[PDB]
Amino acid sequence: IVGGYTCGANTVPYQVSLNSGYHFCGGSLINSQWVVSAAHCYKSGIQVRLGEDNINVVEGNEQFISASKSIVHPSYNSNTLNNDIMLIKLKSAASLNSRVASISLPTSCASAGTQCLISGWGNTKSSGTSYPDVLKCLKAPILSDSSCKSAYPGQITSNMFCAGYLEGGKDSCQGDSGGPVVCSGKLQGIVSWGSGCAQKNKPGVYTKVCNYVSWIKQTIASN
Ligand SMILES: *[B@]([O])(O[C][C][C][O])[C]([C][C][C][C][N+])[N]C(=O)[C]([N]C(=O)[C]([C])[N]C(=O)OC([C])([C])[C])[C]([C])[C]
Numbered sequence: 001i002v003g004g005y006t007c008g009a010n011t012v013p014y015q016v017s018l019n020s021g022y023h024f025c026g027g028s029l030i031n032s033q034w035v036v037s038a039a040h041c042y043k044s045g046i047q048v049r050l051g052e053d054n055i056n057v058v059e060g061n062e063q064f065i066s067a068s069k070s071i072v073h074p075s076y077n078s079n080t081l082n083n084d085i086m087l088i089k090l091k092s093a094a095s096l097n098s099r100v101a102s103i104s105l106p107t108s109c110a111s112a113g114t115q116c117l118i119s120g121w122g123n124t125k126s127s128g129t130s131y132p133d134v135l136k137c138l139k140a141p142i143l144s145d146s147s148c149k150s151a152y153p154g155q156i157t158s159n160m161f162c163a164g165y166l167e168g169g170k171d172s173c174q175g176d177s178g179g180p181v182v183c184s185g186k187l188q189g190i191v192s193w194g195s196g197c198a199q200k201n202k203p204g205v206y207t208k209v210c211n212y213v214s215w216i217k218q219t220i221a222s223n
């Protein structure tokens with residue numbers, strides 16, 4: 001997260017770290033056995049690390065659970081990043097409490113100007129790399145579809161939205177992928193792509209989760 005603030009340990013209890021010997025992507029727990037992340041985070045040998053704050057120190061409250069199957073959306077297109085979403089099923093259910101809790105799926109899409117929280121362990125620097133140890137947080141508004149499309153002409157599908165700041169300086173960045181965008185207590189976005197990090201007129205683009213709620217529900221119910 002570039003331009004953000006330290007969240008405070010376990011203040012974002014639905015955030016997960018997907019790990020394969022290092023943190024590579026964020027994720028959201030949406031019930032005791034299922035995590036939602038981004039399809040471009042897919043790989044095998046994924047360990048879901050729940051209840052984390054410093055990802056480099058075991059501090060208490062951590063639950064490390066192997067991913068039993070990852071389910072990339074069938075229409076995921078890796079050249080457009082359209083339908084960038086994947087569900088990870090956990091090998092055993094997590095124990096839920098105040099430091100590890102699931103976030104709700106939206107019942108409607110959020111309007112332009114809704115203030116949301118984006119969080120993750122990715123790069124904090126726009127020019128160069130600085131990985132944080134602890135979870136970083138950013139409050140950022142959803143941008144109107146016109147300013148999003150004026151920034152990325154031709155690249156925005158209806159499954160995507162921009163959030164952030166046109167003046168630059170604050171944004172998600174590399175290592176934040178797969179992580180949550182929560183607006184009024186509902187998971188509305190998944191961190192996906194952008195042109196670099198926190199550059200002027202280039203906001204982050206996020207998978208629009210309200211379009212996928214029946215898919216999530218139906219895929220979880222059949223698996
Ligand atoms: B994401 O993948 O983090 C995990 C990467 C390391 O394991 C990251 C989120 C970036 C959000 C920026 N607001 N997403 C990506 O890196 C995706 N690629 C891009 O955003 C790239 C750098 N830019 C891009 O595709 O657009 C142009 C610059 C216009 C070419 C990618 C990995 C899906």
Ligand SMILES: [Ca+2]
Pocket residue numbers: 052053054055056057058059062
């Ligand atoms: Ca830790």
